Design a protein around this ligand. Structure first.
Ligand SMILES: Cc1oc(Cn2ccc3ccc(Br)cc32)cc1C(=O)O
Ligand SMILES: Cc1oc(Cn2ccc3ccc(Br)cc32)cc1C(=O)O
Ligand SMILES: Cc1oc(Cn2ccc3ccc(Br)cc32)cc1C(=O)O
Ligand SMILES: Cc1oc(Cn2ccc3ccc(Br)cc32)cc1C(=O)O
Ligand SMILES: *Cc1c(COP(=O)(O)O)cnc(C)c1O
Ligand SMILES: *Cc1c(COP(=O)(O)O)cnc(C)c1O
Ligand SMILES: *Cc1c(COP(=O)(O)O)cnc(C)c1O
Ligand SMILES: *Cc1c(COP(=O)(O)O)cnc(C)c1O
Ligand SMILES: C[As](C)(=O)[O-]
Ligand SMILES: C[As](C)(=O)[O-]
Ligand SMILES: C[As](C)(=O)[O-]
Ligand SMILES: C[As](C)(=O)[O-]
Ligand SMILES: C[As](C)(=O)[O-]
Ligand SMILES: C[As](C)(=O)[O-]
Ligand SMILES: C[As](C)(=O)[O-]
Ligand SMILES: C[As](C)(=O)[O-]
Ligand code: NA
Ligand code: NA
Ligand code: NA
Ligand code: NA
Ligand code: NA
Ligand code: NA
Ligand code: NA
Ligand code: NA
Lengths: 380, 380, 380, 380
């Protein structure tokens, strides 16, 4: 029924055999056959399929309202598997501020295999229409993006991809299936870095992919079985377990996000704030029309590098570390940590200023997170 | 010093911090930074590096006398990472009877990216010399191969690859680092399905890669970090643990292999036997010159499909299942299980007859394994 | 600061060595000593102490505002360790409806060792005063109790125990440290079946004990080290992980508890409802004075056994299984499942009627849980 | 059939449901019931029974030729459960040099519950006959003992216990079921610290108990369920896995033991050597009659404390740490590490001299272990 119930009872996460109310961990590579080719429960070799991995795959398929799920050893392994649907000579359109790892994979790995990449400002979907070439075969969008939280119209992108014969892909990491369901809006494939919110506890690196398309699912299963970037059973189990509390965690994060943004907008040491909940944010209405909540990632400007470092040192409850979607709130400075290879003039032009801070809001007490960040900003 | 000591004390598999005599399992995705960019022990994000994965990587680098190790989510993920060293238009030479998963990856995935594949009978290394094109960039060999255990001269292949500017790769799964060390013979990259002997307990799917080449190691690390087929920490731990007993397991397996082959050669219901220890086997002397023991995989012919099925049903201690390198002995029929897509006339021509049985010798009592297989053959 | 922040940042649950933001899993039994008796970080043998177990022990000590924590292989192992503080000839007072496993341990095991047990209705603390003998050395109370949720005044029991030289113990399982902190009210020892709410995911069996008393802590450490009922490192890790979401889970459970009780009180097929939040419940004011929330366990009467079974069959979201404190709501019938050895006339006299149903409210959507239980009751 | 086969195929260590060739890890606390009291596969609550724990219990029952197995959270938890078969006023006879943890549990814990303990030199079984009181109910022996490896006649002790109505218990840790099977010699209960050889990899703390007596098994199951010192599922799995290689490990250890003892007996810096394989060792013939191999624990005298410390520092392959039965060889000095609370004059009288060194032989290369210990002794 409602989302919080679906999180507990959706998918197959119990043991039909013993009745165990949690998915058994099949730390196993192979399976007895009673006769040659007769598999007791459909399993024959864990790379091809493993029951614990099948459990988490059923969960992500259910949560995204798809038919088929796939679990990979990381988010970028899921992305690479999806890109491998294409052939040399094919063209893929991506949002222009796509995740750094995605941009690296496409421009430094897959370009050597003849895949051509164009980065497009998809906040206006007619940019996609202009960028389509005869060889374009895939449209890949994140929304909202990192670290400036740009929003792209999912439904319109799905329609464009249908009309032009493209495979449409949404990286739904920042929103999670709790708030945004791209397959319901016509997208062919949805994927996640489960390393972030889905696992939720900073203790699994994993990717998840869901689709309703039987033929794309067959192709993805073949790619998974042949290139072998599969998630192991212990990590699959920890994913199932972490997803149980996804709804509670996201709701707490959202309460804190709302109060923190109020504080940041009022504070004199903060300039611009980036988050899709802000009414003046580009495509705010598009976001509200395709999602019923918010990501916990916020970016905001302080004056300079020194202020950013001082802010980090002055907080008690914000942890300096890579990644996002933890139960701990995390803080980072993109210009120094993720975007430092880009020359400073280009960073400035793109809005990645020296004082741009990114926080990933965790599940600490809302008042504590607001007060801590405020007093730290007061030290500037 | 000696191999069995190196297996226990080689690599870094203790905790410098607490002194724990086993590698801690770092079920974690990210790491506190004390200042922006200052990593306490070199860790910042588990996809890039994880201490438990670094432990197993140090083990495989030590065991293969290399400098750099890499742990992947499966053997075929390690193979795919190594193939991704190449660009569209490049050509790779493989032994003609390479592992089915390798052939599938190259001919159904990487060929779509412009990688060209030629299958060559490398049991005569001058076949490699003939097959080299101007665009050839990699030579990839298994020895001994599956399921007919063909042997390829590693040292000569390394010399050919050096002379012609090729990256040389040996899939050393069947022999393990306990018996065969391709990097010592001049090969650039050695890799393993750790799913088999290294893990040894049929409970991990994993790949391992080792090299002494700093530049190839940098390229492999970039590919791993960008396409993300990494081994998780629990599986890395179980690998380290299983490798501890590699020497004992391989030695027991070898004692049983010798006695089983004597029995098979004497038995009237068995025709041809395939194993590199047999003096009339092609390149037996090459094998003995590049290895100081034997794989536990043996293939032998009984009369037909019905005899093969009857043999399997009549054994007590041979388990019908996919994979090899378990503590249990495993039995299979390639024509029905791994090679069934090849038309029967082609199978027959290649020696994959309907009665070809493959066994992977485990660590059961030698007398029991000999007697069990013999009495089962007596029922034919 | 506030409880939800303390749950994330309280205790020591990161790695000082690598900075890993989660507690490493020390799957290890022993530790290198650099010189005889010089321990690198205080560890020498995992039965005595293990770093992952020390992490969860620090968490429970912090959450209960104690100084010392202890992790056991189950709730009843924690209880047995605490009972072993006593000697033959000593007397222990327990609430008269104590948990079945506790009653079994004391009356069928520890009584054979000369420990004498008296069951007392502690809802009136003067019953404790009457029951005190010269040999009484321990007062052990649960509040609220199972399955009728009787409430005992913790502060008054602590004062009585101080005055008469008794060790006071509270089994705080049903309330958790999120809502009730017995050590703050003067109790010597607090303990939990961490199998329930603390782990929270029905995937760990564990006990936890906390105290502020240095001498009792030394005695408990000696008992743990000598009788060895220690929690293992994987289970310790899963406990730390599950406790992260304790606050969110308990708050969702409490919202659902309030709405479900409204529904049950209004429903014509339900007679008596047992829960400390009900204003006419005995010692409701005592509960509100010593706790700032509620347990998720509720008991209520339907007409008879047949109605109870029908109710269970008619629900969609209530799972028939033993235990409580899961993310799934659980349903049971004490007269058939936990109390069936008591003769029916005694059960009836005690209020354990054939139609008494117990539910443990999970974290499903509140509206779904209310509507599901209501429609199922409507089928009666 | 033969022991090495039984180690692989004995007990139930596969999944009947999927065919997985390894025991699934049931990280779970409770189990769905299809109707009240109808358990799908006999499971209802993991403290009472867990399928992974049942797997390791079946293994130890099979390996010891018993009917019932029990897995505890440590060796001393298994011992405490067995002692709890007794009542206040009962008397237990133990060998006089029993393991320190056992002596501590009995003389500092169970004596407070009215259990009376007598330490007896059981190397002459008539000492047992003299020590029997009207209240004696249990005879508990280790053989060989620590650290002087005293041997006790198991068959004669079993006969004495039968004749006088005692429960007989053998702590079979040092010999393992691979070499010594006390239940076959008439003993009622056999137990192990599985922390040592059975797990074999220094990564599990665990106890195991086996019996053929249905009534004692029922009593032990009740004690386990009521006091809750159960082994968790991950540790149970690692035990099953480690036991697979028990035979190979013990055989390698025995080859090394034989060569090391030759070296120690010849070396001028070594005085007395303690090991049951030495022909002049007390009850050498008794040991050879009740076992068909040897423990890997050896003790030997060097001159003094300074020589012992120097020896430890001079070795390359002997690791200074507590415990025994690892894949690494371990070295210790009992007078400083396990027996330091005993006054020095008593230690000297008992043979625990300042220069007594204990080694636990691991599975390193035999020549390496001999040569390393010899060169280190040469530095004296
Ligand atoms: C290493 C990296 O490469 C890219 C892609 N990329 C290439 C040029 C370029 C200019 C601006 C921006 Br924004 C992204 C750009 C993003 C990242 C990252 O880690 O964030
Ligand atoms: C699915 C598969 O594809 C191949 C490669 N391949 C293609 C044609 C062909 C002919 C003979 C042999 Br031998 C191998 C061949 C091997 C396998 C396998 O699973 O074994
Ligand atoms: C097996 C069990 O033993 C007890 C204790 N006990 C002994 C007599 C008795 C009468 C009423 C009540 Br209420 C509890 C009683 C509780 C339980 C249980 O599992 O619930
Ligand atoms: C702490 C400990 O207590 C004991 C039992 N115990 C009591 C007196 C005594 C004298 C000699 C010997 Br030998 C053992 C003795 C053994 C150990 C141990 O850790 O080894
Ligand atoms: C309600 C419910 C669903 C249906 O979810 P939708 O969001 O309507 O697609 C699926 N699974 C479970 C367990 C549910 O309770
Ligand atoms: C002997 C030894 C080595 C060296 O091994 P080689 O086979 O000579 O390369 C490495 N590590 C350890 C722990 C050793 O004992
Ligand atoms: C606030 C806070 C505490 C103090 O908790 P109290 O309930 O006041 O005892 C402890 N630890 C952390 C991490 C906190 O944030
Ligand atoms: C041989 C065998 C047994 C019997 O072992 P004994 O030592 O004769 O009691 C049990 N299980 C398996 C799997 C065996 O192979
Ligand atoms: C500006 As539009 C609504 O075509 O993305
Ligand atoms: C910013 As990242 C998830 O590539 O460490
Ligand atoms: C036949 As040749 C020795 O050139 O591989
Ligand atoms: C023969 As296989 C390791 O691809 O199941
Ligand atoms: C009735 As009273 C307040 O002495 O527990
Ligand atoms: C009611 As119970 C936790 O002893 O199964
Ligand atoms: C000396 As005797 C054989 O009675 O133990
Ligand atoms: C000698 As010990 C196993 O009690 O650390
Ligand atoms: Na738009
Ligand atoms: Na669609
Ligand atoms: Na050749
Ligand atoms: Na080289
Ligand atoms: Na009262
Ligand atoms: Na106090
Ligand atoms: Na004797
Ligand atoms: Na018997």
């Amino acid at each position: 029924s409602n989302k919080k119930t679906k999180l507990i009872h959706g998918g197959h996460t119990t043991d039909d055999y013993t009745g165990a109310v949690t998915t058994p961990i099949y730390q196993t590579s192979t399976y007895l056959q009673d006769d040659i080719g007769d598999l007791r429960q459909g399993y024959e070799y864990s790379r091809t399929a493993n029951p614990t991995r099948s459990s988490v795959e059923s969960v992500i398929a259910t949560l995204e309202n798809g038919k088929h799920g796939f679990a990979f050893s990381s988010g970028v392994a899921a992305i690479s598997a999806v890109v491998m649907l294409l052939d040399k000579g094919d063209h893929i359109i991506l949002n222009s501020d796509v995740y750094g790892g995605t941009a690296r994979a496409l421009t430094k790995v897959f370009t050597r295999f003849g895949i051509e990449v164009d980065f497009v400002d998809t906040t206006h979907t007619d940019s996609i229409v202009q960028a389509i070439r005869p060889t374009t075969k895939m449209l890949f969008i994140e929304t909202p993006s990192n670290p400036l939280l740009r929003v792209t119209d999912i439904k319109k992108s799905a329609e464009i991809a249908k009309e032009h014969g493209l495979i449409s892909v949404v990286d739904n990491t920042f929103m999670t299936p709790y708030y945004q369901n791209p397959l319901d809006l016509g997208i062919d494939i949805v994927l996640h870095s489960a390393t972030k919110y889905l696992g939720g506890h900073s203790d699994v690196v994993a990717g998840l992919v869901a689709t309703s398309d039987d033929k794309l699912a067959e192709r993805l299963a073949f790619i998974s079985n042949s290139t072998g970037g599969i998630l192991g059973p212990q990590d699959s189990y920890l994913l199932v377990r972490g997803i149980k509390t996804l709804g509670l965690r996201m709701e707490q994060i959202n309460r804190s996000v709302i109060e923190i943004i109020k504080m940041l907008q009022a504070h004199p040491a903060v300039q611009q704030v980036f988050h899709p909940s802000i009414e003046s944010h580009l495509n705010h209405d598009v976001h509200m029309a395709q999602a019923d909540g918010h990501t916990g990632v916020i970016a905001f400007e302080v004056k300079n590098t020194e202020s950013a470092k001082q802010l980090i040192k002055a907080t008690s409850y914000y942890t300096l570390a890579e990644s996002l979607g933890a139960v701990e709130s995390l803080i980072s400075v993109p210009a120094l940590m993720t975007h430092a290879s880009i020359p400073a003039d280009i960073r400035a032009k793109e809005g990645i200023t020296d004082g741009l801070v990114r926080i990933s809001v965790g599940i600490e007490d809302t008042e504590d997170l607001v007060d801590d960040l405020k007093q730290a900003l007061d030290t500037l």
